[PDB]
Amino acid sequence: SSLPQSFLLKCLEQVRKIQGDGAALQEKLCATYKLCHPEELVLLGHSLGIPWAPLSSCPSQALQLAGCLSQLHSGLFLYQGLLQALEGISPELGPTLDTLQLDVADFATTIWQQMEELGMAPALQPTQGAMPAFASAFQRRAGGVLVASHLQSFLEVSYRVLRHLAQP
């Protein structure tokens, strides 16, 4: 394929890595606030309007890429802006949250560059977002379990899209 073996494997690493990241945070919210089930928060979810990322330009819509990495990438970028807007949550978390923030960031640009190295990257690098509130402690406490839990699947899908993109 037009996607370098290496680039893809680098992408998968990062996924497995961020997955862990998420999972640490999720499990450290669950012990520090007893918020283990993101069902309970569904309502809270809408109550804030958390724009979740979509990712259905790849799953198998054909066999044309770019515009796909595109979507991917944009998602990453979105979550990255949610996690930002999570404001470190609370001191005891903050570091856990901050590694994920960083790693996600890096997957985010690991794509974007591959996208410039194939021309499909807009010349112009977005800085947008209408980021939700998360004013209160609880909003962020939950905000966290919510976002984590969405991200966490956005990934299982990107996984698929890549483990399978690594056999064209």
Binding site: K34, L35, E40, L43, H46, S47, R141
Partner: protein
């Protein structure tokens, strides 16, 4: 979506707390009508009593009888489906106010050149509680208030604090006590009044053997430089090495001796000796005994 608020987030021992859930109808499929249920994390709480504005928000207030749990989470959740929806959560602690810190004491360490106080904080409060060593230069009985009070703060966890030289006033008296506060109250140790110089901890000279009659010994001991400057009194004790014999103390010694001879022993050819010191006409406390030195007698 709604919003919890309480009287007190932290509270005594086992007292009550009282909270409000102001569940707003602005976001809610089945409008707040499905009764809002209070939990202590996965535990329905009796008492709930559902008020109104009427055509407003549909609030409820509740009263926790006796919060008997150091930490606990207060879940204000409604009903959307067959699933409870947390809408706000709040953390509640309860424990004790702190006790008087028992057994405060100080040393002056001639090496760090500073004053080391320490205490015991006894019973755990179950609450984030900071300690602090206040101190002040005085004179006299310290009663006559010295004015500038100096906070010296211990390192998280540790139960002793340490005041460096630049903040001491050797040969004069200061007041020192420990303050203990968590959010239920503050307590204080009894106040100490001292001259850092009368709490100096000494270190004993190290006994050693010689180089150049019978039933005798010769040893020698070299000073402890840091203490050289402090007229101190020492004592030597000795007892034969094997046997369960009783230690024999010997008269008053000096801090250093180039040659000492101990006679009147048994050519028992095997004694243990240790010496220690203490600042002399001036106030001071004894010193650990030196490590032991073993040597045989003449014959």
């Amino acid at each position: 979506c709604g919003h919890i608020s309480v009287s007190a987030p932290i509270v005594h021992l086992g007292d009550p707390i009282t909270a409000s859930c102001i569940i707003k109808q602005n976001c809610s499929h089945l409008d707040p009508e499905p009764q809002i249920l209070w939990r202590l994390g996965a535990e329905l709480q009796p008492g709930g009593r559902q008020q109104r504005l009427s055509d407003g928000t549909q609030e409820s207030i509740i009263t926790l009888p006796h919060l008997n749990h150091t930490q606990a989470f207060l879940s204000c959740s409604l009903n959307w489906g067959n699933s409870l929806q947390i809408l706000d959560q709040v953390e509640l602690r309860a424990g004790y106010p702190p006790a008087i810190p028992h057994n405060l004491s100080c040393l002056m360490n001639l090496t760090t050149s500073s004053l080391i106080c320490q205490w015991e904080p006894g019973p755990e409060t179950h609450l984030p509680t900071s300690f602090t060593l206040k101190s002040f230069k005085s004179r006299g009985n310290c009663q006559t208030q010295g004015d500038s009070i100096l906070d010296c703060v211990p390192k998280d966890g540790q139960s002793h604090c340490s005041i460096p030289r630049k903040h001491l006033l050797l040969y004069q008296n200061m007041g020192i006590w420990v303050q203990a506060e968590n959010a239920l109250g503050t307590s204080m140790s009894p106040q100490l009044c001292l001259d850092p110089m009368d709490v100096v901890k000494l270190e004993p000279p190290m006994l050693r053997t010689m180089d150049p009659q019978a039933g005798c010994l010769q040893l020698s001991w070299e000073p402890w430089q840091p203490g050289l400057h402090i007229n101190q009194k020492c004592e030597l004790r000795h007892k034969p090495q094997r046997g369960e014999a009783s230690w024999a103390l010997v008269g008053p010694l000096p801090l250093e001796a180039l040659q000492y001879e101990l006679c009147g022993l048994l050519p028992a050819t095997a004694y243990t000796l240790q010496i220690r010191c203490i600042r002399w006409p001036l106030p001071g406390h004894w010193s650990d005994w030196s490590p032991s030195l073993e040597l045989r007698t003449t014959e």
